[PDB]
RNA sequence: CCCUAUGACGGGAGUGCAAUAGAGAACCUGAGAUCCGAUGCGAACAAUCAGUCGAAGGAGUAGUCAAGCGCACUCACUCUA
RNA sequence: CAAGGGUUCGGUUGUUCGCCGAUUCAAGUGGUACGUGAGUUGGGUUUAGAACGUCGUGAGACAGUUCGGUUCCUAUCUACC
RNA sequence: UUAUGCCAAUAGCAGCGCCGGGCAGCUAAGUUGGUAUGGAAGAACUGCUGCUUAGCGGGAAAUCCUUCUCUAUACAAGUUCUCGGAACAGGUUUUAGAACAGAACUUCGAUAGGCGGGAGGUGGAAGCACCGCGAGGUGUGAAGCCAUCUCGUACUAAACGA
């Protein structure tokens, strides 16, 4: 994947921040079915161009969504106003090269992404709460017809006077699993719309039933 | 005089329960004391309140005190008699539980010259 | 076995925080946290 | 959504008694996170007073009980909300006191003699319109 | 970055002395022990061992530095990351192509006396692997190593 | 007898050689462990029979005395680290 | 030279071992209190019963054999999620 | 089986009473997606110079960087913007959740409920008409209902005069 979008030979173009709308099922011309995800880009715009000259690093501050003065907390109302930039639901920074540097106040959209090529998403995933092992890590469990008060628990660290009561950094039942996990080197974008600025992807994009995803690798 | 004193003896609710709430009004205004007390839920607040208000009334009925220039300077608890009893367990093993009681003391003084800091607050 | 040091350290951070904003029925007597049905008028 | 911590038979057979008493009397004082639950059966039993047919009456015969609060509904609550489209209870939060830190709540109907929060007037709904998705509100400042 | 390299001289006492150790590119340990003294204030008379009066000593041009023998590719630095198994190891060639400051900083750190004023002494030490330093406008005393270098020579 | 409490063993008034919260009812003397306090200093980047010896500190601050009303002594002293 | 990643299932035996049948890229050798019961199991084996062979002149034993034979702990600390 | 006298239509109970179904949610038996490139140093092993001291180059799923994650209590404690009645706090929820936390909404408002419209599940409501003595069937009728999902509407509860 090269010679597309808008840049020179080699750089990283900025990322674009969208919302997981759901999944559906398309078909191809060769009569085969692929699952589909629709990522909705809410008129994302540039709100701060970060600078090695002044600040120290090369970053485009893309805002997404829409918000209202009754919903922002004044310390950011001031930010948006000083930038003179329409209000957005969530901010997000990207580090991109010296080229691929945008003017304050240029909106982005899905035609930034050439179809047929790949992306990398980052979606703060769907935690499940204070789960335990055997689901958190796919541990096994002792039988259900012989052993008591263990039917679903775990084992015990290596342990004896040597490795003296020193459980190394092991694997225990633990709190939730909501985090940001990329799906590296995604599979090509089916289609993106001129209006409505959606985009369909072959499937399995992390993030909630809405409100969370980022995209890069292009 | 000064440091008007009001104690309450035989409070039949354990000391680590009473002082837990007393620490809330350990050192501040009597008005807001009487107010935080009736919006706390813990059921030691009612006796702590009885005691602070009784201190204020004694401080009034004894001369030389302005029950609005009052603020609790010091106040604490103290264990009292607790009539022990046997305690039962499995396997015939016995134990003892002690139904506890305690006392509370409050000691108030005028707000001598600290309104100047308070308004600054 | 474990002494005042640890006992105080453990019971401390479970300290009582004075309650924030607290309103009274201007004339109807009672005091209350917000969002209550003290009174009517 | 609430379970209240009760076997799903006993839970119903309580909620029925609660809505029925809420209709016999006019106000009740109950634990809030359960008032937040009768908040639904009361209205879905007002709707049957509004419909009043034989079908939607013999159905209410199952959900309300105790006394002829059945007839109380059908006769007065209809005629006092023949217009009010939705929202037939107020569910105020009195937190009076209990000995269990359990909140408490007044729950009672709306257009009576002495309500608690003197209501707004029962206005008929406006009729539906087609939803659109312009997403054109910049909200800049 | 003038800021991020000017350090925390806003924290020490300043009012004693600024001194400059510029290794001419000769030898680690014989730079080092001299430092561990000067940067411990044991070299002036008014020493008292319950305090920090370490003078500011500033080393210069750690790129031009010489370590004899062939330890360069033999003596690594070893460090243990807690996680079972691991032992992250790095030779001195790696270390010197990375940052030839860390080398001597760590070395004198180990030489300094093993007490909790050690960190509170290194708080009085700064490094540039150039000759370029922003600590010039302050009273600058360049320093000379002892006159004790006979330097035995071999065939 | 009054004062706040549901109710006073409470607080005053009062008897009493006793201030009777150092006789207020199991009640003289009232100690150590134990608990909650009030003050002064230390205390959230520094590791352990918790100290001993040194010690910058901080604070509370006394006295004698010709010499002059201060300063300059009492290594002042006491806590602290 | 190299430890980065791997190192299977099932049949009889309590089996570790081992033999086997079917497979794989391979079916590694030791350490880790012959890792791991305040994690589990409890079959062997070392309690009481009972019996077979053998020994003891009996009481009984058997490093021979078979059947059955209560598995305690509410986590202070260090460690760790 | 007990009750609402009975018919009618419902309810309780049989640890959903038992069946046949069952959306959203969850899961995997399902579906995705990865098992890479580039860069440096460099293992035996290999070569060539040398000038007998040395010089460099290939050189392994190995080591270290690039991807992914975590991180400024990173104590040399980093940088940028903005707020200053600003941040909190409380209340309705939550795609988030043991409390805490995060995120949404807090009346120039869609935060949850409620009501209307669909979608989505069950699968021909009752009453009425017919056919037959009946069990029962057919029409009125994709009827009837509704755990969820969307969509309209502030009708309820989320302002605030501490």
Curated annotation (Swiss-Prot), chain A:
Disulfide bonds: none annotated. It is found in: Mitochondrion. GO terms for molecular function: mRNA binding; rRNA binding; structural constituent of ribosome. The keyword Heme does not apply. Its main location: mitochondrion. Residues 143-166 are annotated as: Disordered. Keywords: Mitochondrion, Ribonucleoprotein, Ribosomal protein, RNA-binding, rRNA-binding, Transit peptide. GO terms for biological process: translation. The keyword Ribonucleoprotein applies. GO terms for cellular component: mitochondrion; ribonucleoprotein complex; ribosome. One of the primary rRNA binding proteins, it binds directly near the 3'-end of the 23S rRNA, where it nucleates assembly of the 50S subunit. Belongs to the universal ribosomal protein uL3 family. Part of the 50S ribosomal subunit. This is Large ribosomal subunit protein uL3m. It comes from Arabidopsis thaliana (Mouse-ear cress). The gene is RPL3B. The chain holds residues 64 to 281 of 324 of the full protein.
């Amino acid at each position: 994947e090269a010679k597309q979008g808008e840049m020179s030979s080699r750089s990283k173009r900025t990322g674009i921040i969208a919302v997981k709308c759901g999944m559906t099922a398309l078909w191809d011309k060769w009569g085969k079915r692929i699952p589909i995800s629709i990522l909705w880009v809410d008129d994302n715009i540039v709100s701060q161009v970060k600078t090695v000259e002044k600040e120290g690093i090369f970053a485009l501050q893309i805002g997404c969504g829409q918000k209202k003065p009754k919903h922002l907390s004044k310390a950011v109302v001031g930010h948006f106003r000083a930038q003179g930039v329409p209000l957005k639901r969530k901010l997000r920074e990207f580090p991109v090269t010296e080229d691929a540097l945008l003017p304050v106040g240029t909106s982005l959209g899905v035609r930034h992404f050439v179809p047929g090529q790949y992306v990398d998403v980052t979606g703060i995933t769907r935690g499940k709460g204070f789960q335990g092992c055997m689901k958190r890590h796919g541990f096994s469990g002792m039988p259900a017809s012989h052993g008591a008060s263990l039917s679903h628990r775990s084992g015990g660290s290596t342990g004896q006077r040597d490795a003296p009561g020193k459980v190394f950094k092991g694997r225990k039942m633990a709190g939730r699993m909501g985090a940001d996990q990329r799906t590296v080197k995604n599979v090509w974008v089916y289609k993106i719309d001129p209006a409505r600025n959606l985009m369909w992807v072959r499937g399995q994009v992390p993030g909630a039933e809405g409100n969370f995803v980022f995209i890069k690798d292009a | 005089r000064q440091k008007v004193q009001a104690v309450l003896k035989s409070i039949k609710q354990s000391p680590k329960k009473v002082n837990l709430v007393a620490a809330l009004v350990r050192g501040m205004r009597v008005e807001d004391a009487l107010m935080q007390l009736q919006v706390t839920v813990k059921r030691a607040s009612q006796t702590v309140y009885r005691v602070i208000h009784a201190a204020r009334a004694n401080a009034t009925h004894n001369h030389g005190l302005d029950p609005d220039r009052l603020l609790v300077a010091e106040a604490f608890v103290g264990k009292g008699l607790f009539g022990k009893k046997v305690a039962y367990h499995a396997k015939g093993r016995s134990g003892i539980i002690s139904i506890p009681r305690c006392r509370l003391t409050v000691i108030v003084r005028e707000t001598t010259a600290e309104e100047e800091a308070e308004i600054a607050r | 076995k474990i002494s005042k040091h640890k006992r105080g350290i453990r019971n401390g951070p479970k300290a009582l925080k004075p309650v924030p904003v607290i309103i009274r029925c201007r004339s109807c007597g009672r005091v209350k946290l917000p969002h209550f049905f003290c009174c009517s008028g | 959504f609430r379970k209240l911590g009760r076997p799903a038979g006993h839970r119903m057979s309580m909620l029925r008694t609660m809505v029925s008493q809420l209709v016999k009397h006019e106000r009740i004082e109950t634990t809030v996170t359960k008032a937040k639950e009768v908040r639904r059966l009361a209205d879905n039993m007002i709707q049957l007073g509004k419909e009043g047919s034989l079908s939607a009456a013999r159905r209410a015969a199952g959900f309300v009980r105790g006394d002829d609060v059945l007839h109380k509904i059908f006769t007065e609550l209809a005629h006092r909300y023949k217009d009010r489209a939705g929202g037939y209870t107020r569910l105020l939060r009195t937190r009076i006191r209990v000995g269990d830190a359990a909140p408490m709540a007044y729950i009672e109907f709306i257009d009576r003699e002495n309500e608690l929060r003197q209501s707004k007037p029962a206005t008929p709904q406006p009729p539906q319109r087609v939803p659109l998705d312009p997403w054109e509100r910049s909200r800049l400042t | 970055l003038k800021k991020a390299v000017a350090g925390i001289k806003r924290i020490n006492l300043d009012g004693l002395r600024w001194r400059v150790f510029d290794a001419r590119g000769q030898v680690l340990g014989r730079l080092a022990s001299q430092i561990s003294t000067v940067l411990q204030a044991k070299d002036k008379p008014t020493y008292c061992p319950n305090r920090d009066d370490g003078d500011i000593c500033i080393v210069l041009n750690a790129k031009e530095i010489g370590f004899t023998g062939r330890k360069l590719t033999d003596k690594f630095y070893r460090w243990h990351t807690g996680y079972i198994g691991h032992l992250k190891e790095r030779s001195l060639k790696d270390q010197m192509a990375k940052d030839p400051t860390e080398v001597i900083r760590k070395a004198v750190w180990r030489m300094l006396p093993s007490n909790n004023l050690r960190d509170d002494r290194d708080r009085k030490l700064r490094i540039f692997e150039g000759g370029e330093h922003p600590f010039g406008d302050k009273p600058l005393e360049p320093f000379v190593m002892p006159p004790r270098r006979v330097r035995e020579m071999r065939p």
